Amino acid sequence: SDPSSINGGIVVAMTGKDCVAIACDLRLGSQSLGVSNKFEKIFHYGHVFLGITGLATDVTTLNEMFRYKTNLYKLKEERAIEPETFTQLVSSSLYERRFGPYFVGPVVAGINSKSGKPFIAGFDLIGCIDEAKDFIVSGTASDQLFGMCESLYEPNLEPEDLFETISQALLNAADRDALSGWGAVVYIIKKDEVVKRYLKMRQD
């Protein structure tokens, strides 16, 4: 009944020293029934990464929408969109459906190509921006993620240390949620290289 917890899933993002990390589980279900273990929730438009939790049809629809908009942006601007700008675009786009909203929990992550500054941001389903320094969480195990992140996180982590922190934050949060898990992906993002890692986790 509750659209935001029919399919299930989670996304988490963190900042480190000259880097950002964004991670998501791979589960898509119909309430109790697990349907797919390859449903990735993180997408990217140039060097800007977007994770989306919530109702899966809207996750897909918004990805296709932001691909649409970022491609037109690039043709006209003659440059790739930046994380700060994209964050504002997501907020605009979500709020225009104020009274008929997409049931989603988007999470932006990336590094500004000009300043080199790491950036993360979160939103509610209707556009409000949560621009945190440390970390952003989203999905059916958001409470669990808040607890993990708030204890495990420390500032200025190196990329390979940040990987361990975000992975453990996701994995242990997902294992306390019935509608999350079934695999996981972690993106480690630096100014001009991005590493994608699939995590080994319990498949129940």
């Binding site: 060097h47 104020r98 556009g127 949560d130 409470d143 204890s151 590493v195 890692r197 699939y198």
Partner: protein, 226 residues
């Protein structure tokens, strides 16, 4: 949320806490609730976060175009009128509860706005879940002919009452001072009485602790030449 506005000798000051909540969870610990409508018209917002942001940007945008059209600095009553008529039209569904303040060629002004579109005038005002804690402080310590220093003190004390006693409010105190014949000074994190203590332990993991299945380089660059 605790937001307050206090009039003084030569202007007006507004303040706010920095806690945003989703039920009993804190979504953001350092949220920015003071919004700029124009250079010398600022308002604090309570209620639904997206709505206070969106309604402020829209009116602030139209106020800017109006200022350019009329070749005049914007007035608080204009922002007030545009906000109330917008909110009234949406019959309370746009959940924005605003304290609008500012200085303009007419003078200094302080108003409150509610989601249904009603406005109120005052020398001291408070809105949000911690407005009762704040209003208790304002009703106890407010007087006529406050100085700038006294008004900032009173405003931040009223926010603190919200921070400590209201669960819907917390973290830091933001302030914005708008004095006549001067630039408005936005004091982000004016007070910071809620820094987290050092943790007992470091939870930095040994590298290789997490089990990995696959690795790959992601192509973020464009299609290449040659």
């Amino acid at each position: 949320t605790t937001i307050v506005g206090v009039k003084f000798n030569n202007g007006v000051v507004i303040a706010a806490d920095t806690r945003s909540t989703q039920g009993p969870i804190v979504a953001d610990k350092n949220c920015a609730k003071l919004h700029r409508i124009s250079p010398k018209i600022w308002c604090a917002g309570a209620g639904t976060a997206a709505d206070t942001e969106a309604v402020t940007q829209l009116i602030g945008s139209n106020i800017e175009l109006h200022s350019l059209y009329t070749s005049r600095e914007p007035r608080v009553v204009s922002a007030l009128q545009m906000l109330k008529q917008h909110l009234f039209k949406y019959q309370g569904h746009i959940g924005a509860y605003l304290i609008v303040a500012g200085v303009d060629p007419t003078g200094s002004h302080l108003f409150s706005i509610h989601a249904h579109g009603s406005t109120d005038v005052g020398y001291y005002l408070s809105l949000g879940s911690g407005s009762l804690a704040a209003m208790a402080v304002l009703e106890s310590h407010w007087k006529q002919d406050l100085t700038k220093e006294e008004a900032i003190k009173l405003a931040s004390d009223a926010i603190q009452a919200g921070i400590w006693n209201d669960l819907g409010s917390g973290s830091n105190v933001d302030v914005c001072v708008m004095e006549i014949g001067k630039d408005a000074e936005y004091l982000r994190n004016y007070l910071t009485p809620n820094v987290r203590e050092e943790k007992q332990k470091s939870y930095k993991f040994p590298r290789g602790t997490t089990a990995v299945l696959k690795e790959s380089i992601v192509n973020i660059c464009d299609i290449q030449e040659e």
